Amino acid sequence: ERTVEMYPLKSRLLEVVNVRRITPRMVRVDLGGSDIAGLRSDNFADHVKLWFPNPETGEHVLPVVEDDRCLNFRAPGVIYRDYTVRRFDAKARLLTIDFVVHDNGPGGRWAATAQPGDRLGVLGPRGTVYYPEADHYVLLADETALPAAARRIEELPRDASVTAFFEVADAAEEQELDAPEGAEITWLHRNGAAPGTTDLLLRALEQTEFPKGRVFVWAGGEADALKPIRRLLKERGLVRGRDFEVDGYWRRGVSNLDHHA
Ligand SMILES: Cc1cc2nc3c(=O)[nH]c(=O)nc-3n(C[C@H](O)[C@H](O)[C@H](O)COP(=O)(O)OP(=O)(O)OC[C@H]3O[C@@H](n4cnc5c(N)ncnc54)[C@H](O)[C@@H]3O)c2cc1C
Ligand SMILES: [Zn+2]
Fold first, then answer.
1. Closest ligand to residue 7's CA
2. CATH class of 1-129
3. Domain with CATH 3.40.50.80 in the chain
4. Which ligand ends up closest to the CA of 111?
């Protein structure tokens, strides 16, 4: 059964140790430091809030945590954003985060200049969500949700079937993934269209025959793009949490979208 487990909250200050520019618009960052003690991540969509410096003020507000709650979400000067735990290696003591590099916000702009020695406040994960096994996983993701989708794919048993549709800017943004045998992974290219302005994921889903066996559909990406995907799944009688999950990670014209509500 679908199960939530909470983690204890603590304010961590971590430092960039490795930077890997894996594709032109994505940078993979390993964060470390003694604060990483006690950090946990059990599932593919686990995410932290990263707390960034202000590039203009030089100000850098970090999380304040007291009695298992963050106290300063509404303090002035804070810049926090949700990012996926791409990988967590407890023995290496390193937290890996994949950042989309874009110019529209401070998280994207920080990623563009990320280098060893940069530090970030790291809050969470608040907890983790376990799912029962499925026979066939259908995954849809634009670049903000690709880290979680890729983590999922690489953690699947070799027996699993996968059908994945990943929307990226162009062919140079494709990644080589360690997927189960026979996985079907399709890279969809915006080819000049701006992020969040196409219906490429919906169109791919519409062309996909519902597979055999126990199926789970997971979609993440731009909130408005996901609305017709949610509707399509529900109209075929599928139930949120059991048959699918659809999670808006960002939304055009909105800064720091809260995906909880
Ligand atoms: C659970 C969760 C997990 C996430 N994991 C990741 C992750 O692993 N990697 C990752 O890159 N993102 C991830 N995101 C998305 C990320 O939180 C947003 O993209 C966030 O808005 C980026 O912060 P920002 O400061 O760059 O710009 P913001 O200040 O939040 O937004 C400024 C403007 O830029 C736009 N914008 C925001 N993101 C993008 C984008 N990627 N491309 C184009 N325009 C954008 C906004 O619509 C807004 O107009 C995740 C979201 C959630 C909810
Ligand atoms: Zn969350």
1. 2
2. mainly beta
3. 130-261
4. 1
Resolution (A): 1.9
The class level of CATH for 130-261 reads alpha beta
104 lines ligand 1 (CB under 6 A): yes
Residue 70 Cα to ligand 2 middle (Å): 14
Method: X-ray
Name the residue among 129, 123, 90 with its Cα closest to residue 242.
129
